[PDB]
Amino acid sequence: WKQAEDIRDIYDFRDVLGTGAFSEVILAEDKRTQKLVAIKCIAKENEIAVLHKIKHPNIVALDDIYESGGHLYLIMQLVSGGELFDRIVEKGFYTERDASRLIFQVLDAVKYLHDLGIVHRDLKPENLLYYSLDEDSKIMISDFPGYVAPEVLAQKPYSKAVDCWSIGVIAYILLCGYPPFYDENDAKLFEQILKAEYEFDSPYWDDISDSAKDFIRHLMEKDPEKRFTCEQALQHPWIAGDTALDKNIHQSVSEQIKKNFAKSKWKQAFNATAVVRHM
């Protein structure tokens, strides 16, 4: 931990990244290189030391660590592309290939974690942020209901296989815009979930490839042992192959996302403008 008399000796603070979760992260400029960075102040060790060495293209890195006063300052890798949903909703052209490249990157990052012994456990659409505002931008896993694995809910010993269910869920949403499990009152929803009751609904899933449906089923498998490992999912023709279609499914997906994942801009927002403004 590089000691520092004051973190401000090293970085010039700008604005916070957004609201909710994002208000805990400070955008700042590296005085020396003028490089823009995200900074989380952990008031005050091994977890952090572990994180420090987790290196993957699609996970948000912890570049450096500085200790100043009674706090730990985690200099994080900065992303400026904003939230997954925000971007897709404003895409205009979205297809199965786009969804598959997204799922791929997530599996690529997650398998990386599993090999590293780590299990995410809390993997959902909110944790995915576009590296940048570029169209070819890669999706990144930031932090480190229907999303949470069945065996978890059932209070059974979780496995690394929990992450793979979550990914199947995400894949589902990326192909239709609505969650695969929903019901008025929780109790009725929870049985649907704990029993893996879901469907590639008639209107919505009319132009989705059977392959995608198959890929999903195997991840969204109630039986943990019958469930695709991150490696198997990566071997599936939808991911490693050429089965993903390039038909624009933006309309239904976009339409469903707005109805299903609506929330205030003051709730838990990533102020992409603040980054690009100082970019």
Q: Residue 18 annotated as binding?
A: yes
Q: Residue 19 annotated as binding?
A: yes
Q: Which residues pair with 43 in a beta bridge?
A: 71
Task: Give the separation between CA 178 and CA 93, rounded to whole angstroms.
Answer: 18
Phi, psi at 8, each rounded to 5°? -70, -10
Q: Residue 200 annotated as binding?
A: no
Task: Give the separation between CA 100 and CA 104, rounded to whole angstroms.
Answer: 6
Q: Which of the residues 9, 122, 143, 206 is marked catalytic?
A: 122
Q: Please say whether the beta carbons of 141 and 135 come within 8 A.
A: no
Q: What is the DSSP code (8-state) at residue 55?
A: -
Find where tokens 């960075």 sit.
Answer: 37
Residue in 34, 32, 109 with CA at minimum distance from that of residue 78: 34
Q: Residue 20 annotated as binding?
A: yes
Q: Which H or E element spans position 244?
A: none
Task: Please confirm, yes or no, whether 122 is among the known catalytic residues.
Answer: yes
Q: Which H or E element spans position 57?
A: none
Q: Residue 81 annotated as binding?
A: no
Q: Residue 21 annotated as binding?
A: yes
Q: Residue 24 annotated as binding?
A: yes
Q: How many CA atoms lie within 13 A of 142 on its CB side?
A: 23
Q: Residue 17 annotated as binding?
A: yes
Binding-site positions? 17-25, 40
Binding-site positions for ATP? 17-25, 40
Annotated active-site positions, please? Answer: 122
